Each structure stands twice: as C-alpha cells, then as structure tokens.
Short mmCIF file of C-alpha atoms and ligand atoms in Angstrom, two decimals:
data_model
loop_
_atom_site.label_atom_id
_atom_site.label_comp_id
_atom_site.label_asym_id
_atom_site.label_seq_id
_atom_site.Cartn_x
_atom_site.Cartn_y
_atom_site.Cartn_z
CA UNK A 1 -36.10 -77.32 -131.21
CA UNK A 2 -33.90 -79.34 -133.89
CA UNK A 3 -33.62 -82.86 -133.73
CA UNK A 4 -30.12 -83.83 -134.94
CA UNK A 5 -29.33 -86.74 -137.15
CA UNK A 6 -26.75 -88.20 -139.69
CA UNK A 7 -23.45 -86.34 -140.37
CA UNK A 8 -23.87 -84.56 -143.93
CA UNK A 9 -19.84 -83.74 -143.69
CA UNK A 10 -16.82 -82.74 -142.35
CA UNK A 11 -14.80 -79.35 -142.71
CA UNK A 12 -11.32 -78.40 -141.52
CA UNK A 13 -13.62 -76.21 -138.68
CA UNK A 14 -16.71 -78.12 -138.17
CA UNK A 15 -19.31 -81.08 -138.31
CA UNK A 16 -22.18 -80.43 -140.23
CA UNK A 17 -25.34 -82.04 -139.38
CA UNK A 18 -28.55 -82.77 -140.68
CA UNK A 19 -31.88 -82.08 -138.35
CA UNK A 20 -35.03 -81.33 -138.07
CA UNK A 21 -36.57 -77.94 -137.34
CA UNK A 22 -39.71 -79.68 -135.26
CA UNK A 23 -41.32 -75.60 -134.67
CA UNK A 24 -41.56 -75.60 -138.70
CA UNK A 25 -41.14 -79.11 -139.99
CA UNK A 26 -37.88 -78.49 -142.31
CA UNK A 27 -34.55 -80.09 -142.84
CA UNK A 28 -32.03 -78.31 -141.91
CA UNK A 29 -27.59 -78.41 -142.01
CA UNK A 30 -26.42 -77.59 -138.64
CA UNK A 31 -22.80 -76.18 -138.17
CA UNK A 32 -21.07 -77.31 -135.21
CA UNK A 33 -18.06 -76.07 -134.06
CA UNK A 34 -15.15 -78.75 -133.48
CA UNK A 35 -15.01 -80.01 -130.14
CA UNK A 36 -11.59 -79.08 -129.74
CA UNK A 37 -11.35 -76.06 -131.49
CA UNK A 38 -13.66 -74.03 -129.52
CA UNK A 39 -11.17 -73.62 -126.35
CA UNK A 40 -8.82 -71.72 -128.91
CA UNK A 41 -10.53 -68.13 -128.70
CA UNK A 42 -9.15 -67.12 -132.50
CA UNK A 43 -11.30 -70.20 -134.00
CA UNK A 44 -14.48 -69.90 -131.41
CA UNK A 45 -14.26 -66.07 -133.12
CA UNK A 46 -13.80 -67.12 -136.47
CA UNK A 47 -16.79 -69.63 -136.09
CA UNK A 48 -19.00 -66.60 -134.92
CA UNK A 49 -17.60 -63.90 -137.07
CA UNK A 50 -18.31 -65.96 -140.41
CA UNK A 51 -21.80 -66.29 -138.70
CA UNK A 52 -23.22 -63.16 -138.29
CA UNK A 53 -21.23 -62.05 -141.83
CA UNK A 54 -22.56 -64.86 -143.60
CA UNK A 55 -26.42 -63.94 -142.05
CA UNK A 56 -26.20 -60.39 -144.34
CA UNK A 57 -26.83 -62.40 -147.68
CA UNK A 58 -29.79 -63.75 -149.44
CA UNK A 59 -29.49 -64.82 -152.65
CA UNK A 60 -30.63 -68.27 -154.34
CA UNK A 61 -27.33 -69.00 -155.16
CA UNK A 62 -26.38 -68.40 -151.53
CA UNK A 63 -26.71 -71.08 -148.33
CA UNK A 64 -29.01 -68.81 -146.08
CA UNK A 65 -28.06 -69.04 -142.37
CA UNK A 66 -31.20 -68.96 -140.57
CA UNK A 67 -29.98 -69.01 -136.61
CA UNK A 68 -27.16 -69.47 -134.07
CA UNK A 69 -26.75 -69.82 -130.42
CA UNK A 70 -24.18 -72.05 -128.54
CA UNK A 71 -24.92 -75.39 -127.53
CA UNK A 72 -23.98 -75.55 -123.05
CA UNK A 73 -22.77 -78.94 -122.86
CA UNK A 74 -21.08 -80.65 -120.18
CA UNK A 75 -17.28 -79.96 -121.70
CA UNK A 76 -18.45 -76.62 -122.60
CA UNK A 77 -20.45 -74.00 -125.00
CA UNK A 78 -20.27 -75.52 -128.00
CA UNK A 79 -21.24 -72.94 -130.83
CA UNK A 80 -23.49 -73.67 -133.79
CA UNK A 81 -24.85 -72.28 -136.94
CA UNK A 82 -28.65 -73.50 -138.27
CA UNK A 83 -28.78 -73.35 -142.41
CA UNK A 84 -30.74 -73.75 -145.43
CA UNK A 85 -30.09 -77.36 -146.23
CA UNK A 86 -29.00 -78.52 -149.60
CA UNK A 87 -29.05 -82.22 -150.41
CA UNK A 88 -26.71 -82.48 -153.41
CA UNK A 89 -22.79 -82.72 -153.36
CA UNK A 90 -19.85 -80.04 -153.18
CA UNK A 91 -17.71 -79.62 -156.53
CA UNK A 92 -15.09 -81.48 -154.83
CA UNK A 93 -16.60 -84.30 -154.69
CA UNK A 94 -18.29 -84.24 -158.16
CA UNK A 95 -14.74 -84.34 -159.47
CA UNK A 96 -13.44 -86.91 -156.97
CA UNK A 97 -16.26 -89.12 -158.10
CA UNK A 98 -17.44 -88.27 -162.07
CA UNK A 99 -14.20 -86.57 -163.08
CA UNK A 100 -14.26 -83.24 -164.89
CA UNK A 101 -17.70 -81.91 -165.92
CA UNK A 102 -18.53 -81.21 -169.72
CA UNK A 103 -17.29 -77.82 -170.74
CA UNK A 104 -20.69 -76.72 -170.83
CA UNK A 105 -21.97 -77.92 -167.47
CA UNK A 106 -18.80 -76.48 -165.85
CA UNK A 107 -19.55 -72.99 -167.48
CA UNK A 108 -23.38 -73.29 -166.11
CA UNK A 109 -22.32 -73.86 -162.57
CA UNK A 110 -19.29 -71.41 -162.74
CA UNK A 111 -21.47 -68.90 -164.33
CA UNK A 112 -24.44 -69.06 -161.10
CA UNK A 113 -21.63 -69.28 -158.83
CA UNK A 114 -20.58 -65.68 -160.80
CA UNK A 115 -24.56 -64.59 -159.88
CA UNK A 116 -23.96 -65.44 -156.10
CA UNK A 117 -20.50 -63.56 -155.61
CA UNK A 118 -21.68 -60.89 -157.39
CA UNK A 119 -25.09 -60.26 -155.46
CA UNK A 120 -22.13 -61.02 -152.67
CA UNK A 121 -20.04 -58.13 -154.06
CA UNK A 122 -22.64 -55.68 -154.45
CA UNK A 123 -23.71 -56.09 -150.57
CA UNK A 124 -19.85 -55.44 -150.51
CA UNK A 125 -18.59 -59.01 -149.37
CA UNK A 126 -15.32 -60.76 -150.72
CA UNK A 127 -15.78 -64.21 -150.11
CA UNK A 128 -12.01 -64.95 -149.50
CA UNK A 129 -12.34 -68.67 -149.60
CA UNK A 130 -14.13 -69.66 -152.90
CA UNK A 131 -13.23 -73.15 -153.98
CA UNK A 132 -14.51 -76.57 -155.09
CA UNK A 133 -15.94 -77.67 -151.72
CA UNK A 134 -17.24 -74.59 -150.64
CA UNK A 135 -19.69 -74.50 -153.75
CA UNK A 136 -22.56 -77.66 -153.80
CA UNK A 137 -24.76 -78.61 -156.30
CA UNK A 138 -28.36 -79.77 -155.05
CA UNK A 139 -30.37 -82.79 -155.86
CA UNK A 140 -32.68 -80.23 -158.42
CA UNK A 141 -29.45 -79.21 -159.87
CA UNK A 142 -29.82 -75.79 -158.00
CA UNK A 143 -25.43 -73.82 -157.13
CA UNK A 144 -24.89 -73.06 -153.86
CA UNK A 145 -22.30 -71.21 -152.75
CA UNK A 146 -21.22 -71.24 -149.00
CA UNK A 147 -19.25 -70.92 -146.15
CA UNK A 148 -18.61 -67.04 -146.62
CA UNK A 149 -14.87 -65.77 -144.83
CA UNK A 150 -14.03 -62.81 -143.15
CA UNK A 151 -11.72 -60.20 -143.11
CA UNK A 152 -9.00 -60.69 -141.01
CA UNK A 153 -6.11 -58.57 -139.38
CA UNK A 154 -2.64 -58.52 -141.14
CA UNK A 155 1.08 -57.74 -139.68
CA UNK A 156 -6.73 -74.71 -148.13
CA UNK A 157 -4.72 -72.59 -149.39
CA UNK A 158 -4.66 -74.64 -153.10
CA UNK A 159 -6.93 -71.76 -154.54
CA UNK A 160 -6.00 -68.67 -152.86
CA UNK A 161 -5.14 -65.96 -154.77
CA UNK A 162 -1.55 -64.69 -155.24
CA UNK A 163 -2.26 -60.77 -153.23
CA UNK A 164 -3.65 -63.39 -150.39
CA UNK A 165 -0.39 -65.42 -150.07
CA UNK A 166 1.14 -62.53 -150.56
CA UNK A 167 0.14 -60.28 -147.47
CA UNK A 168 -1.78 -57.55 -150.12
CA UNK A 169 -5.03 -55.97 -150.45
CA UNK A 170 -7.50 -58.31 -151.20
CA UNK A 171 -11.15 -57.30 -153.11
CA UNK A 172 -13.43 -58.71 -155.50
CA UNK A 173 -11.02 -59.67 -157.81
CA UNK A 174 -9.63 -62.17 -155.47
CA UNK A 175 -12.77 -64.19 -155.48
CA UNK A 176 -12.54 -63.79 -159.23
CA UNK A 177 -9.32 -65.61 -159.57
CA UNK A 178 -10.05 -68.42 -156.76
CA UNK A 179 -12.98 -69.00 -158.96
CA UNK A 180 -11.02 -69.03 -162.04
CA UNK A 181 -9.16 -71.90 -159.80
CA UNK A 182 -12.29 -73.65 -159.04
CA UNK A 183 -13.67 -73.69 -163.07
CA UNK A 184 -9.86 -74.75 -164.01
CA UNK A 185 -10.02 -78.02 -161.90
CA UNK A 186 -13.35 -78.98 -162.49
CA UNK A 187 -13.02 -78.64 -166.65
CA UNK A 188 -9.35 -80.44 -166.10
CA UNK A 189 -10.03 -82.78 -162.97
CA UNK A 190 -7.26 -80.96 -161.00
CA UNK A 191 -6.12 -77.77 -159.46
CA UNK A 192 -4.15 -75.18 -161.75
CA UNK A 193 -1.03 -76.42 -159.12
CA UNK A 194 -0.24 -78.68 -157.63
CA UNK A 195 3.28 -79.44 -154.91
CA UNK A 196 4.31 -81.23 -152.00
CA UNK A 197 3.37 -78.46 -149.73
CA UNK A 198 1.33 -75.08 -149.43
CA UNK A 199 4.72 -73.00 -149.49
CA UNK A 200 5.25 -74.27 -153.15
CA UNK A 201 1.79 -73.99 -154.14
CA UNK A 202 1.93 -70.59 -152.88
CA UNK A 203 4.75 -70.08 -154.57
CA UNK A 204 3.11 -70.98 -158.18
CA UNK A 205 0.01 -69.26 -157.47
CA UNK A 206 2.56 -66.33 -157.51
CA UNK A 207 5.24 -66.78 -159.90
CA UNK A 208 4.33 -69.76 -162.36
CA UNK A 209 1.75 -69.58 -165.02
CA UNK A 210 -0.55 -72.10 -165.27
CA UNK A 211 -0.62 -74.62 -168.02
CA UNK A 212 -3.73 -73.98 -170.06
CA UNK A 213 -6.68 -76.17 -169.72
CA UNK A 214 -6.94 -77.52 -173.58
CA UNK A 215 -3.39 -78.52 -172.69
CA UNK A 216 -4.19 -80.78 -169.22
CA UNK A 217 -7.63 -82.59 -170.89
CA UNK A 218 -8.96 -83.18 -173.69
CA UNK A 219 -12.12 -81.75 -175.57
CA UNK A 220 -11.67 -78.20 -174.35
CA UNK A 221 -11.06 -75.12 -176.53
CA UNK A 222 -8.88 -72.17 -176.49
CA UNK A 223 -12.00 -69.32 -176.11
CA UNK A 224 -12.32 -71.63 -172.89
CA UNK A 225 -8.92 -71.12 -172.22
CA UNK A 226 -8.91 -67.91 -172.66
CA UNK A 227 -11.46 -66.84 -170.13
CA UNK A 228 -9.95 -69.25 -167.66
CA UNK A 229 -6.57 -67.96 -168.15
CA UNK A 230 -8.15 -64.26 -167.79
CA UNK A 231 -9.32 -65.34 -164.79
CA UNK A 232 -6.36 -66.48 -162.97
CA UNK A 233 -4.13 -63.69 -164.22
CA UNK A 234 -1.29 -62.70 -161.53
CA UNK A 235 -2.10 -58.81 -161.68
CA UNK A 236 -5.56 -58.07 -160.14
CA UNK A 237 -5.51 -55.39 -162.59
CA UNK A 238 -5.33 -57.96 -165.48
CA UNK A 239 -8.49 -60.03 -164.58
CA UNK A 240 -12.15 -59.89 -164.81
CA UNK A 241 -12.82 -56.67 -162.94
CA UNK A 242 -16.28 -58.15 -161.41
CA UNK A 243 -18.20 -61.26 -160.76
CA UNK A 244 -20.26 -60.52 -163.71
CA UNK A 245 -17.62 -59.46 -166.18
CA UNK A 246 -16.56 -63.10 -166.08
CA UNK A 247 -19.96 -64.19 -166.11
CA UNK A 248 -21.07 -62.75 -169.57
CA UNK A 249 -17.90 -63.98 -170.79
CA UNK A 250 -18.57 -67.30 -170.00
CA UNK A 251 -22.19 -66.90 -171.26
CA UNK A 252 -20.14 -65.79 -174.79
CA UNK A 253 -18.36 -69.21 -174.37
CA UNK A 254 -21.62 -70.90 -173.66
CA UNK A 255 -23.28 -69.80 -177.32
CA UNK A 256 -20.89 -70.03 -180.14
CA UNK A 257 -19.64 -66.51 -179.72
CA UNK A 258 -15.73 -65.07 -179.21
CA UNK A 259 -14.88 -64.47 -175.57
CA UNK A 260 -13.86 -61.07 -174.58
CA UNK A 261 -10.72 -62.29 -173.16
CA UNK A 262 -6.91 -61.60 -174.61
CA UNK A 263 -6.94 -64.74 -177.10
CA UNK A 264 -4.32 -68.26 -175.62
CA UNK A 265 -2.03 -69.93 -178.05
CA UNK A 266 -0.95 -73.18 -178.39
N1 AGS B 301 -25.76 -76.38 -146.14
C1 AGS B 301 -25.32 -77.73 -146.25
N2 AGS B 301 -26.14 -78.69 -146.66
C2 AGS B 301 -25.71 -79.96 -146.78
N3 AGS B 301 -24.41 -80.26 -146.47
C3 AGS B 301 -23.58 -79.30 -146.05
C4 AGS B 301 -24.02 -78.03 -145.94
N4 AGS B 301 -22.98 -77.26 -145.50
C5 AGS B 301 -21.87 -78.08 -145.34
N5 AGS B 301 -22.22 -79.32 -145.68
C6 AGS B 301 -21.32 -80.47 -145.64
O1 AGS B 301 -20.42 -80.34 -144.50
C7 AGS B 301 -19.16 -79.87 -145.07
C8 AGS B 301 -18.30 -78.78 -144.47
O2 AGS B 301 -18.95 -77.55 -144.36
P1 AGS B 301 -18.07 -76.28 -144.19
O3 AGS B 301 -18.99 -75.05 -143.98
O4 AGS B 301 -17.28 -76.08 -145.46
O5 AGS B 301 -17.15 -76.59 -142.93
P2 AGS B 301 -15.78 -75.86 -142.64
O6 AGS B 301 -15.33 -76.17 -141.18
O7 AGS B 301 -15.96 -74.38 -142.79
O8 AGS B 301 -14.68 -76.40 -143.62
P3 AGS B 301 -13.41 -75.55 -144.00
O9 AGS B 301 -13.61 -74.95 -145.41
O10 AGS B 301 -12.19 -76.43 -143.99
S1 AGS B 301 -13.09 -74.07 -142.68
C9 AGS B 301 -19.07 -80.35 -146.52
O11 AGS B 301 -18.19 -79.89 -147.47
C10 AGS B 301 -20.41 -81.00 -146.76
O12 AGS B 301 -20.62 -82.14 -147.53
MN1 MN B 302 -15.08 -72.44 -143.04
#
C-alpha cells in the first residue's frame, strides 16, 4: 500500500521515510526501525511501545500516527510506524542553519509546543524526551511536536531534566523544564550546557545554574529571562506547574506585559 521514497531523516532509532499512501493518495513519513537494532528485544519494544502510546493523541500540534505493522523481510520483521507527514524542518536544524530565532518567533513556537504537551498532559502523557529535534516546523509555519517516549522501569540526554538523570519521579514538570531547554538554545543558539560528555552535562543539569540568556546573546531581555530561568529551575516544585502556566507567561512576554516569573538580575 505505500510506495516508499527519499529519506526525510535519520534518528538515533530509526530511518524515516517519505511515501505514498496509493489507497488514499497522501504523503506520508514512515518510521522504520534500524536494521540492526531490531534483533535487540529492549529497542524492537521501545519502537512498538512509543507506537501504540504515541497513537492515543490528536492534537494539531501533535504528529498523528496513523498505522503500524512490521515489514517480513528476508533478514527479518522489520517494524514500522506510518505518520502524518510534515514537510518543514526540526528546531535543530533551524538553529544549525539560521542561528537563534527572534525572541518573538521563539516564544510563538515555544508557546504551541506548550498547546501540544498540554493537550499531551491532560490525556495524562509526559513526553520524556522534548527537545529541539523532536519539535518541526512545517512549510505553512504549522509546530509539530513528535516522537512521544514512554515510561520505563527503574532499579540525548543534553535536555533531560535533572529528577531524570537523577533516578526520581518524573511528571509534567519534566517536560516543562526540557522545554525550558529547548526555548533556551533556540533564543541563544546553544544548549543551557554544554561538556565533553553526558556525565558532566548531567552533572550541570543538576548542580550548576545556567547562565541567563540576555547574558549568552544579544537582544534578549530579562522578563525573557525570567520565564526561561523559571522554566529550568532545579526543584520541580519551583517551575511552571503545567504546560500552560508557562504558556500564558510567555504570551505576557509576547505583549508588552510583566511575566509572572520571580524577576533575573544582572
Ligand atoms: N513526521 C515527519 N515528517 C517529516 N520528517 C520527519 C518526520 N518524523 C521524523 N522526520 C525526520 O526523521 C528524523 C528522526 O525522527 P525520529 O522520530 O526523531 O527518530 P528517532 O529514532 O526516534 O530519533 P531519536 O530521538 O534519536 S530515538 C528527523 O529528525 C527528521 O528530519
Ligand atoms: Mn525516538
């Protein structure tokens, strides 16, 4: 039924196609499982869990996943998720090829990305995994946010919260400050830390504040500031309780008005 074609991209998982849907005429992204990958049983779960949690949403702001099934080729089953195509770019890329965004463009996209986790939250879903190229921005200018995690058991990593390199209780609030992460780097062209490994990024996510984003690029402002810095506050407790708590404050930000937020000095 689809007709493949070119590779849109490549994940740390998966290579994502473009096709054809030939029973109703419609591009769509397939997800394919890495070759390799699939013979490990933890990642061929992974790959299926994400699916079916991922199928639970529908939400403009959200990639819809329309199908699955499992590809029997000659090495073996290859699994494979069928999506809502979006021809545009990840955030990721928009930085590594325009540089930051404009205040006000960044607090637009960060601010729909707030309407998707939030819709998200209320279906009770953490997305666990919310960073810059997990969010795309479509051709018609249109946020998508995608490739939904899953809980996991317990006994990148660049924009992981500090209770999820630490082995805590993760909720809502989690997504909150890995999007505080993603709005940081794409007003300041970087990530909040930076290190020659995950261990001491981890480490700073959880025991280093991060230097304020009027401070790392120009033309920002400290109401900005402040809301970012809310955002990525150690304590859960400290943060934006919701999705949309952060989203009115950046709407505050957006107009000329005060931000919520504890104030930032320079
Ligand atoms: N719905 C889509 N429409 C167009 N391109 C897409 C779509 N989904 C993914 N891509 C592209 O293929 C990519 C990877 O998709 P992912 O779902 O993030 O794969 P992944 O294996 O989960 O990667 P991770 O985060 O390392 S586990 C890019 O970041 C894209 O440019
Ligand atoms: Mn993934």
């Amino acid at each position: 039924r689809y007709e493949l074609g070119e590779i849109l991209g490549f994940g740390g998982m998966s290579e994502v196609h473009l096709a054809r849907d030939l029973r109703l005429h419609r591009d769509v992204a397939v997800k394919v499982l890495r070759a390799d990958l699939a013979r490990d049983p933890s990642f061929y779960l992974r790959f299926r869990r994400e699916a079916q949690n991922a199928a639970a949403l529908n939400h403009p702001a959200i990639v819809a996943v329309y199908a699955t099934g499992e590809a029997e080729t000659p090495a073996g089953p290859l699994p494979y998720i069928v999506m809502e195509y979006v021809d545009g770019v990840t955030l990721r890329d928009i930085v590594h090829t325009e540089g930051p965004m404009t205040p006000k463009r960044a607090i637009e996209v960060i601010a729909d990305a707030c309407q998707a986790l939030n819709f998200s939250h209320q279906n009770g879903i953490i997305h666990r995994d919310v960073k810059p190229a997990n969010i795309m921005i479509s051709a018609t200018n249109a946020v998508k946010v995608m490739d939904f995690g899953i809980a996991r058991a317990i006994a990148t990593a660049q924009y992981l919260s500090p209770e999820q390199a630490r082995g805590d209780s993760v909720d809502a609030r989690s997504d909150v400050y890995s999007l505080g992460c993603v709005l940081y780097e794409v007003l300041t062209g970087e990530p909040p830390f930076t290190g020659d490994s995950p261990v001491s990024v981890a480490y700073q996510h959880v025991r280093e504040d991060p230097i304020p984003p009027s401070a790392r690029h120009e033309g920002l402002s400290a109401d900005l500031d402040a809301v970012v810095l809310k955002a990525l506050a150690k304590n859960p407790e400290n943060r934006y309780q919701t999705a949309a708590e952060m989203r009115a404050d950046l709407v505050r930000v957006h107009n000329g008005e005060p931000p919520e937020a504890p104030k930032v000095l320079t």
